Amino acid sequence: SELRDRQAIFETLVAKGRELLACDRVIVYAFDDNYVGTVVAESVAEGWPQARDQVIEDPCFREHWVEAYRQGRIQATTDIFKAGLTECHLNQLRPLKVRANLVVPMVIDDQLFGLLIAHQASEPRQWQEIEIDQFSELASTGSLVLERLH
Amino acid sequence: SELRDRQAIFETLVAKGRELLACDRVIVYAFDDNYVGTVVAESVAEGWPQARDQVIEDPCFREHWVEAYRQGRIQATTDIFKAGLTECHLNQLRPLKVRANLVVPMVIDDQLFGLLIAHQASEPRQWQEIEIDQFSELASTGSLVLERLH
Ligand SMILES: *[C@H](c1[nH]c(/C=C2\NC(=O)C(CC)=C2C)c(C)c1CCC(=O)O)c1[nH]c(C[C@H]2NC(=O)C(C)=C2[C@@H](*)C)c(C)c1CCC(=O)O
Ligand SMILES: *[C@H](c1[nH]c(/C=C2\NC(=O)C(CC)=C2C)c(C)c1CCC(=O)O)c1[nH]c(C[C@H]2NC(=O)C(C)=C2[C@@H](*)C)c(C)c1CCC(=O)O
Ligand SMILES: [Mg+2]
Ligand SMILES: [Mg+2]
Ligand SMILES: [Mg+2]
Ligand SMILES: [Mg+2]
């Protein structure tokens, strides 16, 4: 089925993503029609909390970032505690132990289906250009495959 | 249908592969149980013969290299005319036009499904570490997608 196909691609991307970056967690954060996000796929190293299946109602995508991510925005943050983020935002990440994150979009037929997100837990991390490129290309490959499958 | 889904992934791999490398041709070369290979997808620049839909039986794989390719072996050849190859080997490449090539494995369910292959047709080409890494990861990503899709 279409949804099973999407899930197979998502599970592939999180597994290869974590292997590529050797980070602590990679997820696909998939959007519903209102851009409420569900963690539909996760690859996480041993010992860290499992975000899989969590529903996170974060309004900043619907309200602020849908267009930029459709246009290919990438956001990389070395230390989430030194990024001017509000407590409301931090409280979404604290239970998952996020200290640094890297966000690339999954754009399928010009629509934002979700985000592929890497986490470094309890440890700041300066994401390097080549890591960002490889992570972005992974998301692009998965998105293009889904475009062609249906 | 596995066959239709297969082609969708292969078309993404060859198109993205040739864009990444800016080379003359990228193909998927898939093995059967005799380890005879068939070119099942191709992206090729203008002016070069279309290698698509060629069955090419090369015994060196089954006789020497299948297990090595399963374990991540590649072939990076800067100039095929300086590799001391036999007339049999040159003969099978002559209709396609191959001056340099990069061969990376596609491993699915711990079996060698085939090879993702890049050709430069009219000049030597020293393949760079970043290119080999990107091309290998493209093949690995596509292989894992197929592994999880069905
Ligand atoms: C925008 C925003 N949210 C997220 C969310 C996540 N990062 C992750 O790693 C995960 C998985 C655990 C999620 C989910 C990101 C990365 C961003 C930044 C987008 C970008 O800059 O490209 C955002 N959301 C909030 C929440 C806050 N604002 C509210 O109105 C309410 C209510 C909130 C609490 C839930 C904030 C502060 C931001 C950043 C500020 C902004 O860009 O508007
Ligand atoms: C091994 C060998 N064959 C190939 C084949 C290809 N290169 C390409 O670009 C394509 C797509 C058009 C194909 C197909 C490669 C890359 C390699 C090297 C493998 C490796 O070392 O990793 C090989 N095959 C032959 C052919 C020759 N030997 C025979 O017994 C008969 C019959 C032949 C004619 C068909 C040769 C000489 C080699 C190299 C020597 C070896 O590895 O055994
Ligand atoms: Mg189907
Ligand atoms: Mg690597
Ligand atoms: Mg489509
Ligand atoms: Mg399978």
Author numbering:
A (entry chain B), B (entry chain A): 435 to 584
Can you provide the manuscript's text about this entry?
Of interest was PixJ from the thermophilic cyanobacterium Thermosynechococcus elongatus (Te), which transitions almost completely between blue light-absorbing Pb and green light-absorbing Pg end states using a phycoviolobilin (PVB) chromophore. The end result is conversion of C10 from sp2 to sp3 hybridization, which shortens the π-conjugation system of PVB and induces the substantial hypsochromic shift from green- to blue-light absorption. Comparisons implied that photoconversion involves isomerization at the C15=C16 bond, a rupture of the C494–C10 thioether linkage, restoration of the π-conjugation between the B and C pyrrole rings, rotation and translation of the bilin in the GAF pocket, and conformational rearrangements of the protein backbone and surrounding amino acid side chains.
Indeed, comparisons of diffraction datasets collected at 150 K from a single TePixJ(GAF) crystal as Pb and then after irradiation with intense blue light clearly manifested structural changes at and around the chromophore. Isomorphous difference map peaks were highly localized to the D pyrrole ring for both units A and B. In fact, Fo(illuminated) − Fo(dark) maps around the D ring and the N535 side chain indicated electron density differences in excess of ±10 rmsd, which were consistent with structural changes in the bonds associated with C15 as PVB transitions toward Pg. Taken together, it appears that blue-light excitation at 150 K allowed isomerization of the chromophore within its binding pocket at the C15 methine bridge, and relaxation of N535 into a new orientation. The electron density differences revealed that PVB moves away from N535 after illumination, and now is in a better position to interact with the D492 and Q526 side chains, which move slightly to accommodate the new chromophore position.
